Amino acid sequence: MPNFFIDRPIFAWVIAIIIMLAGGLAILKLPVAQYPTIAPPAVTISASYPGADAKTVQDTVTQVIEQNMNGIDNLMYMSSNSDSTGTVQITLTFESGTDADIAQVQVQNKLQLAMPLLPQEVQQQGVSVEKSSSSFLMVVGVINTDGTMTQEDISDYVAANMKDAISRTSGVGDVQLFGSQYAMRIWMNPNELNKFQLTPVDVITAIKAQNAQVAAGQLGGTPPVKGQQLNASIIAQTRLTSTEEFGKILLKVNQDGSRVLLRDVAKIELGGENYDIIAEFNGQPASGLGIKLATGANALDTAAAIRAELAKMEPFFPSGLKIVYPYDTTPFVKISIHEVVKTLVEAIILVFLVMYLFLQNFRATLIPTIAVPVVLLGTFAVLAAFGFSINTLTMFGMVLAIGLLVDDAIVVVENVERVMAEEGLPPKEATRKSMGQIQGALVGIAMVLSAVFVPMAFFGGSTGAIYRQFSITIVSAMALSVLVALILTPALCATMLKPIAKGDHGEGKKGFFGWFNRMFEKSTHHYTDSVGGILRSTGRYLVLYLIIVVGMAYLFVRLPSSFLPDEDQGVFMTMVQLPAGATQERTQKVLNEVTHYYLTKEKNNVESVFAVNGFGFAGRGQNTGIAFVSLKDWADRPGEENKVEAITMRATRAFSQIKDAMVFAFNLPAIVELGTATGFDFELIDQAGLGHEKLTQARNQLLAEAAKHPDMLTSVRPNGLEDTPQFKIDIDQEKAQALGVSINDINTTLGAAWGGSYVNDFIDRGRVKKVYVMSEAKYRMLPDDIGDWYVRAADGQMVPFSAFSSSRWEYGSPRLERYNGLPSMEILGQAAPGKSTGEAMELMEQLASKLPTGVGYDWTGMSYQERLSGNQAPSLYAISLIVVFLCLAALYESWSIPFSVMLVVPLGVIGALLAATFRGLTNDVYFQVGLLTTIGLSAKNAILIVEFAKDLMDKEGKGLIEATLDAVRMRLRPILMTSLAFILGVMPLVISTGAGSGAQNAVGTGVMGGMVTATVLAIFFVPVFFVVVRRRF
């Protein structure tokens, strides 16, 4: 087949042409995202039930929904959390790969039937049903710098004058608003109501009454009279467009007709639906747009289009109005591109150098430079053909696939120079023989590696998706290379190489190259001089081979594991917790203390503070909040101190000093879905429906033994929340309707007065919007304000609450969970340093085992997955062991020699470890995919050596050693070529700091060093392996 093209070089070019086009056709159509999808499909339902408590939300809504989720498919597990914001979030967990839409539609439709069973206010508010994405292209912060508006004020211009336009930009799928539109905020004063003997109900029904759609009919509509000729549409009462109108919403009228108005006993202005969360950007009111990268869109493209949209609204911005982008992914991605090609193009040059340093002439040093791009170009077309996207994962694997690409050609063009330099043969005929010798070699190898690299694509869950981005990248680009090696380069080796005389290594050259070749050829001798020595006595080199191998596990197991390196991203979050029920205002001060701190101490590196009050990760309400901070670009942040994690603890150490709060700042997991490799998610489940308290007791009880095994566990904590003093009140039914006082008015006034109540819709500026009714805060603050509110007795007299009502403080849990529809309590912890999770997990199970009757548990999330994808690891290695031996034995027709190859494995791996531990690293896939390209190349150099050595015994007939030496020598240079080229190309990735550096450096170190030992060690020991296997057999 190689000879097919030798006689048809153009027919090689022709293919080499198509590849550049298709590849080129891919570079334009190949998508862009910092990361692809990893997380398994999960649906999340969002329902709100205003002014409420966790158990109401649970009791009335959740469990109802829990029931009807039945019938849906591919469910992994069902999570629920209920809270004292009158909110639910039910996230449904679906098997990886499960169609998320079907997953969606099914859910939402299971919901429709269950919607009726829900409360109306639930229904009138609506519920939101989502696929789970916490990813965002960027956070659009928006601000007004003259202080002339609120964030609610600003909130609306966002939704109304901004939000939709960007929703209509190209490449954005999702537009969130981090603030609420105006709503009509009615604020009711009892003391005015009673004066008029009135209720919110009086207000309510009135609001409903006179703000609504009254549909009419037609004049002249059908059927008409014959003789008709004037038919139109009739227009009659409609919703109100303005507050002042609402004031004229008319509570009541008299027989004389005097008007009691809505504003005659309650203030009115537009407002935020929820005053829950406050925003501050660098100290002033704010909101924000969560923007998410649409599926397959070009991450670098959308963020710009966004910037463009917002550029043209600028004339239309009020004074002080401005935008900010406290968060964006695009910045980190663009560089990630430019860093990869800089790795490829500069490596093509080194090769041009290396081939030059050796061949020292221009023509051959061109050919791989032809050969290397084509596959690269070609690879993108394989990727984009079945449609991977350029991403962080996929770029590192390409560069890691260099090492196999670089050497494929060099090996190829190498063997032709040797034949020429040794046999002086014309390159074209010279080319064939090179191919004649090594053709079977390439075949076996490309079988081997594909046996090494394909295994990992069958990995499960989130992590496997990580592994098959590299794997499918590393399997294709390696395949195309072999086609090239077998096709173009030979016709490039036949045509584009010039003849050289028989017997010339170039010693007779002048200058640095004669000095060179003389040195190298001399460096060749001593090496084999000892190798032959190495071979006279094998037993020693077998003993010492065991030694190296032992330290491998010793250094291998001593090395901890992780998912992903943590990068300075320019941004980091800091998280606050106050005591329980601790108020909002208090919450907001430390923030300003938080915010000010950055701008105070971190002024250099910190550009901005984007603040959130009342919203936690660990649950919501006043006593929590987060400061999302931004920094200046790395180039503005010299040294590690200026870098986040450095910034982090510094910031952290200072916030330790705080009073009243749990303040800690931390980095952002490059993927916020991945959790922790040493940590675990767990559920304390009540199988028996014991209720709550008991369920708790086991929990804390479960921490007791837990905290009695830090030796295994650490950080073992419940994620959820604690019972607070919460205010009971008792209705005395009998006293009530003894006054002739109906219950709902009591209940309804109540939930509406104190809780606040959404009545109905109006429109503003042509925008349909909500109405609310509620008591002025100062009115609704406190229990003594309860009795301030009165009720209209059926007889007309106004009835206070302190009359029929009797109350107490009490404890209740202002958040609640059910897991797969069983009340759950989360726990969170990690394995002790030096301890793996499953050991921890096993112990929870034991400690979970010993819990009270009715107490179950479930592991979940990264624990649920860490359970299933652990079983899979060894069964693949064996498959990955089996396939590998078979193929060589095919190439070799030997049930032993293949072992002579297999022993090279620890030689590259060992050096690889050294560098990760000397730099004190951890075990990750940038490392564990790098552990692979290394091993192969080490089995690349031994197979070939044994190819010739074998070739020397079966063809030239030469005995075992004299061939063994013979092979190692001839292959000396190319190994030296190989290792020489590969090592310097990855050099930048070793020193690389800055954005994306931890990842870059990750691949770099484990690969570089192991390629120090593989290069150097293997070439010594692999001839022994061969000899020790061959002699033994």
């Binding site: 500069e346 150098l353 190298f520 000892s530 020693r540 020489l980």
Partner: protein
């Protein structure tokens, strides 16, 4: 594009070194095995 002139030098300057590295390895290491032979 001082970008390439930036990498061009170092990419060249290291070539003899790393080759100088390993020739010294085989120098020092080739001394190991004769010595350990």
């Amino acid at each position: 594009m001082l970008e390439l002139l930036k990498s061009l030098v170092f990419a060249v300057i290291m070539v003899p070194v790393v080759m100088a590295i390993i020739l010294g390895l085989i120098y020092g290491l080739g001394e190991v095995f004769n010595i350990f032979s």
